[PDB]
Amino acid sequence: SLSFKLKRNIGYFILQTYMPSILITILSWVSFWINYDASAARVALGITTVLT
């Protein structure tokens, strides 16, 4: 038996799927600084965030 042990690099995933999700959550948090009278803006934010 010849056996290797391959360790996967995490740079590409940090680039592709961790950073967009983190920044999408950061974007979702903006929905609190908008005034609570705006009914379409915060819903647009939340819906776009869920969809992304």
Binding site: L27, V30, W33, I34, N35
Partner: protein, 48 residues
């Protein structure tokens, strides 16, 4: 751009002068920044 809009809407209805000022500043500060970034990027990656 989105955070700038959030700040403007947070300052609106309370301090409209500051909101209008930061909006008028961003109007010039964003295109110039993107232009000089494009200049730097294409210059450093087309010379190699």
């Amino acid at each position: 751009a989105l955070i700038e809009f959030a700040t403007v809407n947070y300052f609106t209805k309370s301090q409209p002068a500051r909101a209008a000022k930061i909006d008028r500043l961003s109007r010039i500060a964003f295109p110039l920044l993107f232009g000089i970034f494009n200049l730097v990027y294409w210059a450093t990656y087309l010379n190699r």
